[PDB]
Design a protein around this ligand. Structure first.
Ligand SMILES: CC(C)C[C@H](N)C(=O)OP(=O)(O)OC[C@H]1O[C@@H](n2cnc3c(N)ncnc32)[C@H](O)[C@@H]1O
Ligand SMILES: [Mg+2]
Ligand SMILES: [Zn+2]
Length: 773
């Protein structure tokens, strides 16, 4: 054993030792229990930095920990090759997207292999490969027939810089997720995933996720935005029916979020395009000027009356400029006494305010709005008949049974979740398998003729969809009739491949479907998922929706894709722009380590200067995995000094007697200072085993091993029994730190014990060494 700690010699040799052993290339071995640990797979938008290194190290620490405990661990690594992240980097460097992606894929693969992660590289996947995106094309066509995927025109978010439409989850604070430019609204036909059909299921199965951060679960609940309301039909008075015809001659439908205020409704609003408005304006030019006005808050009365179905009040129908047509049934009711917007609309034209809700005993001010009138949590009913005294949860249920008895209403549920538009006017993306025929229409591509191969030899000029300028691509024959037809030149979003890549890892070479029904049953769901919280509304929701699709198609049998979720904290560093890199202007301050700010420390520059063990140790020790981590060079130096201490500790031990048999069995006869050291040992083994697999607190697990070494240095171990205890302390330490730093621990383990480390396994707690003296 050399006296100096040389990472340049111990790390490549240990990586080859692991590669030759093939301890990460796992199959469906039924002997061991499975453990699917997954880290969010990166965008090939350039070189990885230490921020990604923390993400993938946190996953490696968990994967190596379970592996040491006799687990069949699958830690796979892939490349999120399609979409804007890679294509924008290709255009920024003036390179074809296919070339820039593949060359950066092979650089990022060598970046991760230098860090020595326990990755099953035989399961490596590139989303841009046709052997991959053919199956999301397959699922696209099968869902298109079922109507779950549909094409429709409408109002969409438009990115002027990225020159493409965006989904609602890709619009961050009214700006684009990749561009930051302000989003515009356009009328463009798109392909949508009917994610609203799964809105209720995506909301209830959230409670199943007991091992998800409650922040991620809460953000999804607000994004779905479920609200329970009431659809109320107001019978038009027999005199006010003159003019209307159809359903609008019988009743007028409204939706209200607070239907406990039904009796307190003093009037009713309507839209300008509503037939009840145009019929009342056929003889009134004062309303034909309002109908033509909007087509603030203004309103005109038309003498039309509807019947409040719960008390019989004859509420007049007002034409308002705030009732948007097409949204809902194009009409609402008005309760000014318990609605701020209706209080302003009624204090504007002097309309009644029959109070119906009390909050404890706050004196009701008639013409003074107060925040207690919208209290849907601490309110009973007044002046409502058989509703007086019922809370909102009871007043809702009583009004529902009341309206259903007359047939003038029923409860209705609404979500703020809109359908998922996936059409993109970009080149680098999965082609949409739809062929437009003038005779047949939008027909899907036959499954035998999949994939619709995206030509890789394209360099976008930067002015419009490049696929719409390639006749040799979009000119084809109709698969239904055989005539002239055009291919769909729009491509899918990058969040389509990332919504099922965790299943493709189970069978990356399977040529008959998305995932083999055999391996899908063996791996089940992802046991541990690690990735940034920025995907709580986008990817982490898209993945759950795609899983419920693939399940309802018969390809997988689980409901949720990820059991546990760990949103690791962001690594931060000072930034400079004019963007300038620290190792090479203005001072932007401490910011997230990102390529879009050029404050990223390259992992390869650190391994060349300190080694992979030093970089991984600094990431795991500087802070808990969920906490933000500030980059510190002294933190890098201190982590290296400890790895020197661990190396020098084993050297001086071996240089003073050589390897002996580690102490085991009954410890009576041992001295107190050695009984105390074995006590600290097995307290550390239990503390580390608990900080890894329960608390997931790696920094305090490293600190616990350091305290064990502090007591080892303070304990005299030169005797015959001291060496045996000293052999036990070091055999435990190099196995406890192995998930954090496997290169140095594998080297020191073989210098202490001839056996293979992973067959020695995780250190056990000798509880006899824990009892006090
Ligand atoms: C499933 C897919 C939609 C994932 C998508 N391809 C993606 O986000 O990929 P991207 O290549 O952007 O990053 C890969 C991973 O690295 C994390 N990450 C990035 N910067 C930092 C940082 N400063 N500190 C800590 N962690 C960081 C980031 O949260 C992500 O889990
Ligand atoms: Mg459960
Ligand atoms: Zn046809």
């Amino acid at each position: 054993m050399q006296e100096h700690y040389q990472p340049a010699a111990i790390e490549p040799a240990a990586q080859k030792k692991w590669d030759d052993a093939r301890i990460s290339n796992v199959s469906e071995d039924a002997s061991k229990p499975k453990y699917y640990c997954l880290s969010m797979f990166p965008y090939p938008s350039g070189k990885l930095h230490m921020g990604h290194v923390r993400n993938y190290t946190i996953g490696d620490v968990l994967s190596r920990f379970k592996l040491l405990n006799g687990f069949n661990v699958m830690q796979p690594m892939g490349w999120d090759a399609f979409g804007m992240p890679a294509e924008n980097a290709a255009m920024k460097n003036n390179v074809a997207p296919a070339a820039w992606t593949y060359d950066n894929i092979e650089y990022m693969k060598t970046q991760l292999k230098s860090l020595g992660f326990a990755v099953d590289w035989e399961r490596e996947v590139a989303t841009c490969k046709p052997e991959y995106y053919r199956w999301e094309q397959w699922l696209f066509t099968k869902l298109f027939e079922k109507g779950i995927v549909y094409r429709k025109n409408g109002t969409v978010n438009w990115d002027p810089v990225d020159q493409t439409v965006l989904a609602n989850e890709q619009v961050i604070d009214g700006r684009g997720w990749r561009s930051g430019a302000l989003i515009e609204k356009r009328e463009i036909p798109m392909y949508y995933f009917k994610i609203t059909d799964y809105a209720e299921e995506l909301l209830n199965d959230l409670d199943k996720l007991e091992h998800w951060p409650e922040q991620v679960k809460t953000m999804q609940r607000n994004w779905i935005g479920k609200s329970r309301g009431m659809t109320v039909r107001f019978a038009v008075s027999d005199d006010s029916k003159q003019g209307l015809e159809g359903d609008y001659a019988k009743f007028l439908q409204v939706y209200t979020t607070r239907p406990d205020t039904l009796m307190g409704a003093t009037y009713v609003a309507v839209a300008a395009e509503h037939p009840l408005a145009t019929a009342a304006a056929a003889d009134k030019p004062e309303l034909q000027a309002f109908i033509a006005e909007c087509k603030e808050k203004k309103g005109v009365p038309t003498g039309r009356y509807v019947v409040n179905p719960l008390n019989g009040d004859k509420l007049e129908v007002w034409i308002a400029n705030y009732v948007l047509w097409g949204y809902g049934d194009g009409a609402v009711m008005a309760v000014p006494a318990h609605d701020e917007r209706d209080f302003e609309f009624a204090a504007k034209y002097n309309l009644p305010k029959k109070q119906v809700i009390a909050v404890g005993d706050n004196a009701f001010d008639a013409n003074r709005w107060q925040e207690w009138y919208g209290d849907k949590e601490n309110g009973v009913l007044v002046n409502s008949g058989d509703l007086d005294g019922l809370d909102f949860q009871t007043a809702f249920d009583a009004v529902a049974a009341k309206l259903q008895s007359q047939g003038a209403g029923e409860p209705k549920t609404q979500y703020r979740l809109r359908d998922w538009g996936i059409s993109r006017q970009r080149y680098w993306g999965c082609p949409i398998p739809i062929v437009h025929c003038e005779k047949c229409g939008n027909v899907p591509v036959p499954a035998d003729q999949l994939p619709v191969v995206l030509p890789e030899n394209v360099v976008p000029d930067g002015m419009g969809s490049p696929l719409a300028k390639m006749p040799e691509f979009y000119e084809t024959s109709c698969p239904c009739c055989g005539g002239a037809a055009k291919r769909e030149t729009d491509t899918m979003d990058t969040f389509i491949e990332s919504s099922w890549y965790f299943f493709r890892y189970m069978s990356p070479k399977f040529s008959d479907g998305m995932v083999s029904a055999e391996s899908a049953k063996y791996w089940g769901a992802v046991d541990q998922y690690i990735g940034g919280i920025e995907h709580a509304i986008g990817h982490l929701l898209y993945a759950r929706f795609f899983t419920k699709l693939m399940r309802d198609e018969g390809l997988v049998n689980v409901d949720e894709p990820f059991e546990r979720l760990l949103t690791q904290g962001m690594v931060v560093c000072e930034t400079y722009y004019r963007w300038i890199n620290p190792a090479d202007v203005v001072i932007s301050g401490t910011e997230k380590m990102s390529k879009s700010k050029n404050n990223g420390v390259d992992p390869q520059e650190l391994i060349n200067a300190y080694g992979a063990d030093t970089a991984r140790l600094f990431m795991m020790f500087a802070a808990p995995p969920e906490q933000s981590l500030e980059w510190s060079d002294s933190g890098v130096e201190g982590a290296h000094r400890f790895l020197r201490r661990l190396w020098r500790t084993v050297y001086e031990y071996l240089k003073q007697g050589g390897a002996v048999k580690a102490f085991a069995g009954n410890q009576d006869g041992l001295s107190k200072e050695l009984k105390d050291l074995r006590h600290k040992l097995h307290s550390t083994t239990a503390k580390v085993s608990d900080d890894y697999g329960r608390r997931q607190q790696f920094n305090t697990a490293i600190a616990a091993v350091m305290e064990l070494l502090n007591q080892y240095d303070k304990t005299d171990t030169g005797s015959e029994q001291g060496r045996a205890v000293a052999q036990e302390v070091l055999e435990a330490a190099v196995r406890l730190l192995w998930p954090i730093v496997p290169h140095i621990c594998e080297t020191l383990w073989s210098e202490l014990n001839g056996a293979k480390l992973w067959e020695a396994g995780w250190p056990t707690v000798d509880e006899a060494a824990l009892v006090k003296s």
